Design a protein. Structure first.
Length: 241
């Protein structure tokens, strides 16, 4: 951050947060290109991976910059343009989380995007390490959340829709639809169970039905459907809470 003895000092800690926003402004644009189109092609899926991998590293370097109480580095990212990239990734994490979930071809891309979010939220926790009551970092991070209050809402709804799925899956009202331990049961039976559960609204019901992949017999494994989505939710939503 500050080269003490040198004649000239270059802030690598702020030059690093400058590349993160330049990457973010190239990932949001590449998302906006693909938002209208229904399917993410192979060459547009190979470029999201190759950019999320870079972003996950820029977030790991940034969190290693600040892990351990380093009040010079923690008070330096709080007066930079980090909040403008953290707010911009939250807009991408709130839309491609819903768009990629519906499709079944883009599963690995969703997993990679669901790890970039984790490494960003573990970065956001290192900003509040050694936090104080009424602190500048907390005040500036609350302002970011207020600014992105809609994207965080539509992420928290997505997490809540999947964190309650495990209770329904483990409930006996589902075991009566699926008496044997086969682990697979029909979409019609899923829709009966979700309507009988009465905690999931109609809209959430067709959304979760659409996010379910069908075979020729319309029976998907509910032991992997609740593993592909609940585990990412159980992982990130804890750090968000």
């Amino acid at each position: 951050r500050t080269q003490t003895g040198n004649n000239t000092t270059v802030n690598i800690i702020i030059s690093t947060v400058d590349y993160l926003l330049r990457v973010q402004e190239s990932i949001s644009d590449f998302y906006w290109y693909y938002s209208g189109k229904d399917v993410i092609d192979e060459q547009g899926q190979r470029n999201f991976s190759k950019a999320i991998q870079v972003a996950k590293q820029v977030f790991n370097t940034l969190t290693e910059y600040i892990q351990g109480p380093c009040t010079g580095n923690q008070q330096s990212l709080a007066h930079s343009r980090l909040w403008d990239a953290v707010v911009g990734f939250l807009h991408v994490f709130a839309h491609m989380q819903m768009k990629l979930s519906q499709d079944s071809s883009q599963i690995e891309l969703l997993k990679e995007l669901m790890d970039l979010q984790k490494d960003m939220v573990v970065m956001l926790l290192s900003m509040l390490e050694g936090n104080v009551v009424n602190g500048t970092i907390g005040k500036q991070m609350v302002d970011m959340l207020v600014e992105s209050s809609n994207n965080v809402e539509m992420i928290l709804k997505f997490f809540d829709m999947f964190l309650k799925l495990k209770d329904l899956t483990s409930s006996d009202t589902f075991k009566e639809y699926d008496p044997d331990g086969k682990g697979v049961i029909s979409k019609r039976d899923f829709h009966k169970a979700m309507e009988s559960h009465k905690h999931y609204t109609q809209s959430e019901t067709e959304f979760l039905l659409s996010c379910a992949e069908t075979d020729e017999n319309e029976t998907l494994d509910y032991e992997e459907f609740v593993k592909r989505f609940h585990e990412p939710a159980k992982d990130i939503g804890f750090n968000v809470a």
